[PDB]
Amino acid sequence: GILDILNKVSNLF
Secondary structure (H helix, E strand, O other), X not given: OHHHHHHXXXXXX
């Protein structure tokens, strides 16, 4: 879901 995408983003950055 979008929360997973945000998780990905916030993790990578």
